[PDB]
Enzyme design. Structure first.
Site, PDB file in Angstrom:
ATOM      1  N   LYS F  14       0.832  -1.196   0.000  1.00 27.34           N
ATOM      2  CA  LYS F  14       0.000   0.000   0.000  1.00 27.34           C
ATOM      3  C   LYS F  14       0.874   1.255   0.000  1.00 27.34           C
ATOM      4  O   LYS F  14       2.085   1.181   0.229  1.00 27.34           O
ATOM      5  CB  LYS F  14      -0.942  -0.048   1.208  1.00 27.34           C
ATOM      6  CG  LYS F  14      -2.079  -1.062   1.056  1.00 27.34           C
ATOM      7  CD  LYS F  14      -2.990  -1.076   2.270  1.00 27.34           C
ATOM      8  CE  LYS F  14      -4.114  -2.105   2.131  1.00 27.34           C
ATOM      9  NZ  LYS F  14      -4.966  -2.186   3.360  1.00 27.34           N
ATOM     10  N   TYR F  54     -12.380  -2.936  -4.108  1.00 23.40           N
ATOM     11  CA  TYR F  54     -13.087  -2.949  -2.832  1.00 23.40           C
ATOM     12  C   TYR F  54     -14.603  -3.101  -2.981  1.00 23.40           C
ATOM     13  O   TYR F  54     -15.345  -2.715  -2.070  1.00 23.40           O
ATOM     14  CB  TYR F  54     -12.770  -1.669  -2.060  1.00 23.40           C
ATOM     15  CG  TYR F  54     -11.352  -1.623  -1.542  1.00 23.40           C
ATOM     16  CD1 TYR F  54     -10.914  -2.545  -0.611  1.00 23.40           C
ATOM     17  CD2 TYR F  54     -10.454  -0.650  -1.977  1.00 23.40           C
ATOM     18  CE1 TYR F  54      -9.621  -2.519  -0.126  1.00 23.40           C
ATOM     19  CE2 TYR F  54      -9.155  -0.609  -1.478  1.00 23.40           C
ATOM     20  CZ  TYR F  54      -8.753  -1.545  -0.560  1.00 23.40           C
ATOM     21  OH  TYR F  54      -7.469  -1.533  -0.071  1.00 23.40           O
ATOM     22  N   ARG F  90      -1.576 -14.608   3.426  1.00 22.46           N
ATOM     23  CA  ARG F  90      -2.202 -13.793   4.467  1.00 22.46           C
ATOM     24  C   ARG F  90      -1.538 -14.027   5.821  1.00 22.46           C
ATOM     25  O   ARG F  90      -1.418 -13.101   6.635  1.00 22.46           O
ATOM     26  CB  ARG F  90      -3.696 -14.107   4.560  1.00 22.46           C
ATOM     27  CG  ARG F  90      -4.464 -13.918   3.268  1.00 22.46           C
ATOM     28  CD  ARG F  90      -5.210 -12.612   3.223  1.00 22.46           C
ATOM     29  NE  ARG F  90      -6.236 -12.492   4.255  1.00 22.46           N
ATOM     30  CZ  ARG F  90      -7.147 -11.519   4.279  1.00 22.46           C
ATOM     31  NH1 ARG F  90      -7.163 -10.604   3.318  1.00 22.46           N
ATOM     32  NH2 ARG F  90      -8.042 -11.456   5.264  1.00 22.46           N
ATOM     33  N   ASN F 117      -1.869  -0.284   7.239  1.00 27.42           N
ATOM     34  CA  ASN F 117      -1.423  -1.646   7.502  1.00 27.42           C
ATOM     35  C   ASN F 117      -0.557  -2.204   6.374  1.00 27.42           C
ATOM     36  O   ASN F 117      -0.448  -3.429   6.224  1.00 27.42           O
ATOM     37  CB  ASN F 117      -2.622  -2.552   7.794  1.00 27.42           C
ATOM     38  CG  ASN F 117      -3.481  -2.838   6.567  1.00 27.42           C
ATOM     39  OD1 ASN F 117      -3.408  -2.150   5.539  1.00 27.42           O
ATOM     40  ND2 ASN F 117      -4.306  -3.865   6.679  1.00 27.42           N
ATOM     41  N   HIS F 120      -1.841  -5.533   1.315  1.00 32.74           N
ATOM     42  CA  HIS F 120      -3.085  -6.254   1.094  1.00 32.74           C
ATOM     43  C   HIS F 120      -2.754  -7.617   0.512  1.00 32.74           C
ATOM     44  O   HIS F 120      -1.825  -7.742  -0.288  1.00 32.74           O
ATOM     45  CB  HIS F 120      -4.008  -5.514   0.119  1.00 32.74           C
ATOM     46  CG  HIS F 120      -5.051  -6.394  -0.501  1.00 32.74           C
ATOM     47  ND1 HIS F 120      -6.310  -6.539   0.033  1.00 32.74           N
ATOM     48  CD2 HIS F 120      -5.012  -7.195  -1.595  1.00 32.74           C
ATOM     49  CE1 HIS F 120      -7.010  -7.379  -0.710  1.00 32.74           C
ATOM     50  NE2 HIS F 120      -6.242  -7.793  -1.704  1.00 32.74           N
ATOM     51  N   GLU F 131      -8.904 -10.324  -8.352  1.00 37.27           N
ATOM     52  CA  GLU F 131      -7.960  -9.232  -8.138  1.00 37.27           C
ATOM     53  C   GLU F 131      -6.791  -9.298  -9.117  1.00 37.27           C
ATOM     54  O   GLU F 131      -6.344  -8.264  -9.628  1.00 37.27           O
ATOM     55  CB  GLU F 131      -7.468  -9.259  -6.690  1.00 37.27           C
ATOM     56  CG  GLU F 131      -8.527  -8.764  -5.730  1.00 37.27           C
ATOM     57  CD  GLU F 131      -8.203  -9.041  -4.286  1.00 37.27           C
ATOM     58  OE1 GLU F 131      -7.026  -9.345  -3.974  1.00 37.27           O
ATOM     59  OE2 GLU F 131      -9.136  -8.941  -3.465  1.00 37.27           O
TER      60      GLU F 131
END
Lengths: 154, 154, 155, 157, 153, 156
Positions: F14, F54, F90, F117, F120, F131
């Site tokens: 990000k 999103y 993840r 954070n 992603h 995605e």
């Protein structure tokens, strides 16, 4: 010559701002030098002017002082054989453009005005700089558990 | 270095083992692309160390060199690769850490020449001598790296 | 009069990608303070590699170079900062790893000059040429580093 | 329950995939940095009979022959590490035997994916460590030394 | 809650002796927490006995205090959102045998009595420890150049 | 856990991860684990693309602010390939909210605020497919074979 030589190493405001405190201490720690004093400080303007007194008549003196006031400094005293000269080698060339990768400035810095750190340039200047930046009781007396594996003689 | 199967002897000295530098030193040779073909942790007898230092038997520091190298374990290694003898010494840095460059093993980890954390053969001929002295022939392991053809131009 | 917006082309060659060196090479430039402006993983066509290596087209073993550079993906990058061309070359180390110093990319990771892990432009003018060859102009991302004024005293 | 004896020992092996993928240094550094003492180490290509003895509990399993054949396929960095609770803490450092179940920060959680390519082995009990140490090392290959920082790693002996 | 919460982190004499100052500082620095005070100290026995006031009636108290006198300590104040609780997570379980690899104690320590570092266990105990270990002027006010990239605001 | 070694996931660094100089370290986490990089680019994507990225959160009050934030700097977009790469990816990133994350993960080492954070990762095999196709042109997926595949994988 002697293994109790001391030098002043400071991490400048850009070094603190860019998150380099940890890596810079590790360079000296890993080499075998002993940390004998350390503090995070925002020193007063007079101390910085005295530190840079040799450049007082220079046209950049005022802006250099104001820059060194612009963020905290990690002031340190490191001790070991030839720590002044070898300390400068670890920091790398004062101007990062001339520095070698593997040194602090050769890994982390670009502009000489943002060269991340300072180290005393001579034994005599180290004694002067240590006295300017530290009170004597801020220097801690201790012996490393691996002293005799770092040094062959005193 | 012509042939990619040149070999050199690298030893981590008692101070290197004592100061927890085994992992880092191996990583330096591993990451460069050299192949580990022999390794053991060993405390060799005085006779072997005297033979290792045979070219220095007529030097006054010979006995203390031998006695120091008996004072802790040694991580003995054979590394293989193109120019590994000369490039290996470059990786170790100048024998006297005071003259070594940061980014080398001694430039990152050592101060005194008598505590210079490691040894590397100084020539192809001396490498073959040291390898035969420190290892039995069956302790050299024959294998091919999965990335050989990406390290070496075919 | 070196300006902080100078750009150079850094590429991680197929051997660097194969040997898992993408992260560490990027970190070397990131840590120094240079700004990543463009990046892509790419297996470029033969014609683009031949144009990249135009200066070598009349030298021996030209086909062998191009074939090797076709043999795996390349991580192509544009890095921006003051004197980034010259300093970037110093970070990569001597082109022949046998001549490079530990602490550089090649002095830490490479042995053969024909498998020297990475490429960096050798001049400001060649960097501009290489940047235009490997990237479409919209692939150069204009942004401003939050620590720009702690890396640079001036523009 | 954890061990309380500072001279407990465990057998740690870097498997052929760990050696092949250039993980000898990183793996040694995890044990070195924790404070454990390396008391034996060698790069070894052991005979099939030794690997069969090492895996004797799996001799009747259908995958036995292929497991033995795989462990013959490259060098192995065999080690003995000594320290308080080194058997159980050593396995915690390696991570879950299946890397899919391992935590990042462990060796397998940082470096491995397949349980059949899980880069390393550690003894699963104090008794099996004693057996594995004697199987993989000659007794004179265990090295007696005293770490300069023993008293800063351990409160009691 | 607030991004200016502070906690006291100390590197104990064993951590200093074993050359762990740099790595420990890096864990907090890389996470995004802000160093607001630091000093290397050999504090007097009175200060250590106050720090451990709650254990003054324990049998190990005298040796505990003597041990914490035996080498320098790197005393630090770190600042950031939930830094007390998250700081303890970074250090790992107080007993390293119970800690996870990836934490400070899980990477560097074995014995609970040689567990390399200390961190305040609560916001109120942090305020107490900071007042005990630091003079107020030793706490430096500054703003990180990347504050707005560490914190949403 | 997935069992197909050709599974793919979308990992993005990000704008805060790029701004804070974490590109190298984050790539190394996936590289060192044995996953294969098959696509990567630095990109400043249009608002429409982020809104589609999103889309499953478009009924949430933080949606417009999350989109605006993701426009505030460059993004390092990546596709990684390997067995169980979605779920293990993840796990490498750490818990989405760093407050709940463990040291040794990317967020447990580098991040504090859930709104900052750092990265992603796709949350499912199907959402990874969507995605991947949203962030990359089909020809930006690179076909290659890792020299150490047979040392990372035992079979399949």
């Amino acid at each position: 010559s002697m293994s109790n030589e001391q030098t002043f190493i400071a991490i400048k405001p850009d070094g603190v701002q860019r998150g380099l405190i940890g890596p810079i201490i590790s360079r000296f720690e890993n080499r075998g030098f002993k940390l004998v004093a350390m503090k995070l400080v925002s020193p007063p303007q007079s101390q910085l002017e005295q530190h840079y007194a040799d450049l007082s008549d220079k046209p950049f003196f005022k802006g250099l002082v104001s820059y060194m006031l612009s963020g905290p400094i990690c002031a340190m005293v490191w001790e070991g054989r030839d720590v002044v000269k070898t300390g400068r080698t670890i920091l790398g060339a004062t101007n990062p453009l001339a520095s070698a990768p593997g040194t602090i400035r050769g890994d982390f810095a670009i502009d000489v005005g943002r060269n991340v750190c300072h180290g005393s340039d001579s034994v005599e200047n180290a004694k002067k700089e240590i006295a300017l930046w530290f009170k004597p009781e801020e220097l801690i007396s201790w012996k490393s558990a691996t002293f005799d594996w770092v040094y062959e003689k005193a």
